Design a protein around this nucleic acid. Sequence first.
RNA 1: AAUUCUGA
RNA 2: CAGGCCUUGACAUGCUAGGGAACCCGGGUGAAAGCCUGGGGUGCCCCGCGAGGGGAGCCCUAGCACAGGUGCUGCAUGGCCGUCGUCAGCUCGUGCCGUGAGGUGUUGGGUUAAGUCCCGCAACGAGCGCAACCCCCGCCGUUAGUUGCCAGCGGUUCGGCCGGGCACUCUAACGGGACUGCCCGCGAAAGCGGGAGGAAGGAGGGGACGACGUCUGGUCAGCAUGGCCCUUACGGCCUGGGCGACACACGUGCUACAAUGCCCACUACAAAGCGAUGCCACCCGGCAACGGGGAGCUAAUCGCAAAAAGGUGGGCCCAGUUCGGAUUGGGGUCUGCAACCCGACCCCAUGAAGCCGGAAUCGCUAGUAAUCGCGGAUCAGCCAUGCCGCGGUGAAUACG
Lengths: 64, 50, 60, 78, 206, 50, 24, 155, 98
Amino acid sequence: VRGGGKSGQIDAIKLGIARALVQYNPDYRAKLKPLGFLTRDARVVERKKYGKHKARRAPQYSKR
Amino acid sequence: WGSQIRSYVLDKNYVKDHRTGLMRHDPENVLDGDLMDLIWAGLEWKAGRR
Amino acid sequence: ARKALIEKAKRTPKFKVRAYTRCVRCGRARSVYRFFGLCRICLRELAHKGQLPGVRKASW
Amino acid sequence: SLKKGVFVDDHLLEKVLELNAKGEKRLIKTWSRRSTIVPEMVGHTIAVYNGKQHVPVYITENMVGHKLGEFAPTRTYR
Amino acid sequence: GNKIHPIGFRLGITRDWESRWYAGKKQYRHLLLEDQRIRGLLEKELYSAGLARVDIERAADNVAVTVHVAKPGVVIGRGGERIRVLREELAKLTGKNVALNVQEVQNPNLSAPLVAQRVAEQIERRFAVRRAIKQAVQRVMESGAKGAKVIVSGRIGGAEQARTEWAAQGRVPLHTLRANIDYGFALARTTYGVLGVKAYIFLGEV
Amino acid sequence: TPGPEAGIDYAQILVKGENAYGLLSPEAGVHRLVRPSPFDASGRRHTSFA
Amino acid sequence: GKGDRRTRRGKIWRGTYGKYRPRK
Amino acid sequence: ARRRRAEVRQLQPDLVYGDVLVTAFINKIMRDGKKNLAARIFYDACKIIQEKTGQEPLKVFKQAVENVKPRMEVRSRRVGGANYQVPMEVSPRRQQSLALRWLVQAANQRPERRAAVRIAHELMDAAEGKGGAVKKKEDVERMAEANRAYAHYRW
Amino acid sequence: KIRIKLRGFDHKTLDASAQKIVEAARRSGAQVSGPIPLPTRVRRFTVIRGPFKHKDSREHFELRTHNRLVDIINPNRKTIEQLMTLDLPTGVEIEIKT
RNA sequence: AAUUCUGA
RNA sequence: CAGGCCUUGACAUGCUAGGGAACCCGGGUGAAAGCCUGGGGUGCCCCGCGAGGGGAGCCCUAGCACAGGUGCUGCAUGGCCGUCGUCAGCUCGUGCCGUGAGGUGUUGGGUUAAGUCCCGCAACGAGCGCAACCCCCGCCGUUAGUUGCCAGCGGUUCGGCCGGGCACUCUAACGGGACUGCCCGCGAAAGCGGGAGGAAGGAGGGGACGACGUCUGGUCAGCAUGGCCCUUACGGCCUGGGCGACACACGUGCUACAAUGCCCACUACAAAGCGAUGCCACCCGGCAACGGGGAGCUAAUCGCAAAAAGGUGGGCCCAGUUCGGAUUGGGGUCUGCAACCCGACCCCAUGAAGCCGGAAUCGCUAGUAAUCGCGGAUCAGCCAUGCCGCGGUGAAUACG
Ligand SMILES: [Mg+2]
Ligand SMILES: [Mg+2]
Ligand SMILES: [Mg+2]
Ligand SMILES: [Mg+2]
Ligand SMILES: [Mg+2]
Ligand SMILES: [Mg+2]
Ligand SMILES: [Mg+2]
Ligand SMILES: [Mg+2]
Ligand SMILES: [Mg+2]
Ligand SMILES: [Mg+2]
Ligand SMILES: [Mg+2]
Ligand SMILES: [Mg+2]
Ligand SMILES: [Mg+2]
Ligand SMILES: [Mg+2]
Ligand SMILES: [Mg+2]
Ligand SMILES: [Mg+2]
Ligand SMILES: [Mg+2]
Ligand SMILES: [Mg+2]
Ligand SMILES: [Mg+2]
Ligand SMILES: [Mg+2]
Ligand SMILES: [Mg+2]
Ligand SMILES: [Mg+2]
Ligand SMILES: [Mg+2]
Ligand SMILES: [Mg+2]
Ligand SMILES: [Mg+2]
Ligand SMILES: [Zn+2]
């Protein structure tokens, strides 16, 4: 494995390993699905929009 | 009203001295020191009748 | 004081330092991108008019 | 911070060299504040400018490694 | 104080670069300038025919200069002299292959860039700025078009306080990409001040 | 005397020097001011007197 | 600290290198 | 949360005792997302349980949590220009939140050097019923029932 | 045995100028290796909308440089023809080596 | 149980 | 701003008069600008050997029509931008009621993120907006192999590097896909709830997009433009200063006040970009900044390069501290003509205030907050702790 961060690759490994045995085996669905080791996980660090220090956080509102 | 002897405008940048007729275009400068100009003239106008 | 400046702006002589940027379309001097040799205003202007080769509205 | 040379303006040296050879006057205006006070300069009173006028600054051998701007404050309320 | 340029908005689809060619990060600049001054002098000695676009291609020291027009019989003259004297001028500032096309328009009232200039004139002509819109639209619409729209800026008629004269017909969805709308803008300077001419022509789709 | 809402209500100051009076003398009088009222709601244009 | 010029994070945060953060 | 009644976030089992509770607690111990460090400490402490006591960590951490959950609490309220502090039961879902939280907070209100020790000791007391977390619990309860007067509102 | 670079901005002219040059030699001599598309170099620079000042609400533009690559193995002599002679550039860069 | 906002 | 200077001018079009007509090397005074000043020296239109000429590129001086003005007016204006508001709205055509202003549609019942849809209904449709087509990220396939790979074997200087080979990864450009379609329920419908399958639900997560209009909103100093006004100076050039002052007050931020910590040596895991007087491999002198040499690089082929938090071990052991790095003295490198005002770094010595912050007050609902490090534009250098991007670790809580 390569790219990203360790506690992030470990998560991808849990996908291939969960896709390796599902391939080379039948009884690997009705017990890997209700566990979903097969899912992808769209969760990705989202773009940093302009006028927002951290993508969603905003600058300090003063008014005064 | 109508008693002024020199008005000051800022949204049309100028300063009309009604007494003499003089009219500069720098209210901001006047209002901060610049006076030595209209002071002399102011006198000239006045001392004129004595 | 805008004309005589961009005129002395052109002349790139006397000490290789003073040699400074300057928008070409407009006489501006600030935020003058090196690539187009243009300023941040005469860039959003042309770009929209398509007149800038390959420059397309970014979006990701 | 300039370990190679002394970059001291020439129109000043050329001045404190002919005027130096057989030491004489002192009336010496300038704008070369940017320059260093090379050794020997002592005596000859430089009148550094400051954006407004020429401040007649004396020259002692304690202020040699120093420039000239450092003897004519540019602001008022020092 | 809003609304992107329908043109620059469709820059990737539904309207294409009015100047397509390649340039490295070593010359794109000089060439970009070149293309500019070209359009300059051209927009000068070529208003009698009033163009509406000036495309430009390259690939190896060449130049398209494909000047689309709505009255080519003028850009040429009486056979091929004007068109010949100009190719002359263009090359005068660039030792390049100063080619030069001269397309046309089967209907200039379906090309905003033109409709714009028209009204621009009328304004400086002291015409009824209102009907001057009612008509500049009743034209393009009468001559088929899924959408028209002309917007004039302040000084309408010369009244001290500036007003914006609007008016449109058909359908004009500047929010739908696949809509190929023609945006036309041109100035109209008068004795009392400047005016603004914005025209919207709705054409294609899907 | 820093008046109610804004500005002042009264002010009086000494001018220590020579011909100070002769200088600041023509000033004696009414001074008008025109600009949109920083106080008024819609920053409308009103005239001020002093 | 991120401001102690004479330290690891010192130069790191500084983006510079020195006796306290050499290049290998 | 004006539209939908939100939706409880589900945790992940513990990579050692495999417990949803055991994890929730670690997050509290977490600072700046440094979960790797938060996790360490916990176990680093669960060891201390063994160290100083024959007790069994997972079961100790279970009794403690229980002796911190506040039966009831007094939430503010508006009677009309009136903010009478009314009493009320503490939703199980909330009950646990508070519980876990106070533990950590209190755990740090200890004079111990290391952290593990704190988390440790703080749970060894609570589980018995004599820790800082329990105090800050009894209190939260004394308020309610003490205001059992304005409790005819509840709403 | 021949490396070719087709650096253009639009792909609807490379994935048509490359795949065009491909089977324009594939069928006229030694085989060839398909058009290998290499990573793009972009210019995602942003700019502030308003003319005056409004350091917020901006608009950014990017300049994409699409690169196409195709390498004809055995350099036929029946290839320095429909290729080295038949050029179809319209707004594309072409640099070939070996 | 909490006022006031002149005059283009 | 002070001071020294220039005049049809630093830029355009055009005119009268001899010299001058491409242009080069200078000497003098001076802070520079400027002023002043000595020598090399020209095809050509072409009677003509020539004496000679007009003379186009060309170019100097005096005079001229004009230039130039970040000088005023954003209530004289264009364009562009902010904002209410990513809000569910704003209107039109005909018909109908009304003396008329207007009303109706668009109100009502149900639903949705929505004037989204459904059902009603003197209204029947439609337009501008929401949606949708565009981009990016999640599954997958096809085209494509100098990224990759003992994946299968082989030699291996034992480095995917070499034959080999593109299966994978990846790269890039065209596609497949998700539609409340399928099961159960309520419902007139729209549609809501629950289940299966699937990478993914019911808008999958991000963008771009921001209606008629509001603020006589902002900008005549980016540009443009009407009027007013300066035209040996409100134009122009140069040297020096200032915009970086300091009794103070506010907004936005950086680093901390420390053991979930700091210092040190060792060891891993990224993404998106940028690079030919640019990035610098590796050497070598130096405590180091950096300076000497020097290879590769039109750059998925070389370089910026190390990611950092993390992991291992070790040192502090609760102190104004091995916390914190302000201020200051001293010594140096580098960019630049030149860093005193006023540069960024480096090293020795200082080590300040700060033991969690009054009244108040801001941001965020998930790969978000918090936290760690990197990149770019600008650009000689740089006052970036800013702005715009990228990924690494990764929460709490939502009754209402
Ligand atoms: Mg982040
Ligand atoms: Mg603000
Ligand atoms: Mg000027
Ligand atoms: Mg000036
Ligand atoms: Mg510069
Ligand atoms: Mg306008
Ligand atoms: Mg009174
Ligand atoms: Mg009184
Ligand atoms: Mg909870
Ligand atoms: Mg009262
Ligand atoms: Mg009162
Ligand atoms: Mg009132
Ligand atoms: Mg002067
Ligand atoms: Mg205003
Ligand atoms: Mg209806
Ligand atoms: Mg109505
Ligand atoms: Mg829905
Ligand atoms: Mg609708
Ligand atoms: Mg202007
Ligand atoms: Mg200065
Ligand atoms: Mg400033
Ligand atoms: Mg070197
Ligand atoms: Mg300095
Ligand atoms: Mg606090
Ligand atoms: Mg803190
Ligand atoms: Zn510009």
